[PDB]
Amino acid sequence: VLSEGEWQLVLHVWAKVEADVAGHGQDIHIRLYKSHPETLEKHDRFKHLKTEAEMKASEDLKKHGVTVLTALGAILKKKGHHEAELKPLAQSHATKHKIPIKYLEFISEAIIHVLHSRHPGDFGADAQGAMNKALELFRKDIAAKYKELGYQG
């Protein structure tokens, strides 16, 4: 569970993501699909994209990244009070896209990597720790909402 100070550090580095949502989104997907090629199979409409440059050039992938990180930012900004924001996301990812919690772990790791790559100085151990705890809380709660919908992934 996060202190007030940890939420501040989460929201501090999130403000940096907000200076270029599309770009961070692209780098997170690139890192994710590269580290964990199986996740690219769920992302069905992006299978045609065979190199890093093609990924960067896909407007479709870039718009998708903004939709994702916008949803995630809205959740983070609630500092744990996110049931209303989590429910819709749990609904499509459980019953429509069928995304295992393992895959939410892989994208959390990709987020942390891109934030560390882009902002070492806004992203030391304490800030890393806080974002990790925030993403852990998101994954725990979405896992509980999955089970409520009858999905065990």
- Annotated binding residues for O2: 64
| Candidate segments 48-56, 69-77, 80-88, 131-139, binder of Cu ion by CB under 5 A | 80-88
Per-residue CA distances from 132 to 28, 42, 78 (Å): 15, 24, 16
> Shortest gap between Cβ of 38 and ligand HEM (angstroms)?
8
CA nearest to 134, candidates 116, 111, 152:
111
Binding stretches for ligand HEM (CB under 6 A)? 39, 42-43, 45, 64, 67-68, 71-72, 89, 92-93, 97, 99, 103-104, 107
Q: Does 77 bind Cu ion (CB under 5 A)?
A: no
96: buried, middle or exposed (CB in 10 Å: 19+, 13-18, 0-12)? exposed
Residues annotated within the binding site are 64, 93
DSSP 8-state code for residue 36: -
Q: Does 16 bind Cu ion (CB under 5 A)?
A: yes
